[PDB]
């Protein structure tokens, strides 16, 4: 099983609506949320880690975005 491919990495662009375009995006976000709703601790660790790299202020925030987004989705 573990059907990997998500057809949206391709999709097709056309006048008519694709299969699950709505269900799709909201879904991608709502997955991340009740991921982090169940692990605030990882928001702490991810916070300290990210804020430890780059020294430059904002990318810091880029590191937090990268890390909060990769933990639930792939892994």
């Amino acid at each position: 099983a573990v059907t990997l491919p998500s057809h949206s990495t391709r999709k097709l662009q056309t006048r008519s609506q694709t299969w699950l375009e709505s269900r799709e995006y909201t879904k991608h976000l709502i997955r991340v949320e009740n991921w982090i709703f169940r692990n605030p601790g990882f928001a702490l660790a991810a916070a300290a880690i990210a804020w430890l790299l780059g020294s430059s202020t904002s990318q810091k925030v880029i590191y937090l975005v990268m890390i909060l987004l990769i933990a639930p989705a792939y892994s």
């Binding site: 990495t9 097709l12 006048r15 694709t18 375009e21 799709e24 976000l29 975005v65």
Partner: protein, 494 residues
Amino acid sequence: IRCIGVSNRDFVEGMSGGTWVDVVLEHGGCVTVMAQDKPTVDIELVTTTVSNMAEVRSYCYEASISDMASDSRCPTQGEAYLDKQSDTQYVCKRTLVDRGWGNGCGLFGKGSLVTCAKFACSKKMTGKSIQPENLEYRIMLSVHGSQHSGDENRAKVEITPNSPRAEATLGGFGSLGLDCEPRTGLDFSDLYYLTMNNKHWLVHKEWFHDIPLPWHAGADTGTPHWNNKEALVEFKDAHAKRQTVVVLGSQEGAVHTALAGALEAEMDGAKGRLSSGHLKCRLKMDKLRLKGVSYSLCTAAFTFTKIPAETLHGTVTVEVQYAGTDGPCKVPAQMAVDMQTLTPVGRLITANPVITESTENSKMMLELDPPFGDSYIVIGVGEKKITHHWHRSGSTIGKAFEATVRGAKRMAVLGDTAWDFGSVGGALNSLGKGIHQIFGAAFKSLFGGMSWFSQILIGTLLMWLGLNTKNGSISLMCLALGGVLIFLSTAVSA
């Protein structure tokens, strides 16, 4: 006609010296075309039918395991045989049972057994594939004229990739004569129909060749030899107690879930039918001619049948009885800012508005665009006539401005192969086409790999680069790309 109100509808500028135009059409919306007193006509994509399809591979989304057995040979007896690893559909995974005296063997350690359970399938999904041949379109024609509900002004045109020109003949005036290009359609030769059970949708040859499930090859005679099988039938054991061979259920929810970009089709008895193509058929003209251009002006009473209408695409549609005088005459209408009638402003989207024939009332429905203000539709009798007041909305750039976003999505979905709506740019279009054909490659490849939430963040990230960078080369970068991405996002269906 049949193009009024459907929205999703661009109207073309005109012939412009070529007796010819480049119109892209697709399953939804029409394109009404009006030029230099040639009758205004509109054509929709309808259904693009593909027939005569092959079968390129298959997947079994269900599984039925059977027959089990086991090996149980001792340690340092070498290997366990059990003969099924010889026969072809019985999956085997050899594991090592640390084996004790309960079983009864001389040494102790990894015991080398495998249960080989006989695979089986039910309800395979077929990957049926197509090529540009055995394709088709069945385009439809409109030609407002004067009708309402109904040959004369509606002619269907079958269009195949091997005969890409339309000889489309109309009662009362000359043929349209459109010349299609079906061979570059929506990147075919990459959609292969995917059938699960009594539903069908296109998918490319990447999502479709990437699936982990069993392969199966071309046909199902008898029962097929299933390639792979590792994906279904996952079996492992702990405590070193034989083997647990698990079925792993069915994957319909997976494949349905894994396809978010797949245009859904409908399919009956081969004749695989589709829905959302984009086709180039470029209307040739000069064979179109107004009907009855004279007919005097035709005079009598007029009574509005229906309170007229206002389309969402800047239109007002009117039906009229003409209170019964004469035959095949002609009745004018005007958009008059002044007085009851007087000067004519705005534009008639339908041309040569005409009465059909004979007794009492013949309704002439007329697509009219009032001026951006509020006028008084005028029905045409020099004196006795009914009228209205239409208050069309906006401030020039008001609606012309929105035009700037519709155009965005015109070549947002279609891509640059959507430059053509605009006819015969010649030395000019080339610039528009050559610009994004050189670009269509890169962007189709750099973020071709991206989906909807993908290109949102990448858009945001590049934007955040474009604001904080050095001088020069990347001074303008984000607006060159990140904006493009966050736009293609908010574009499409939106």
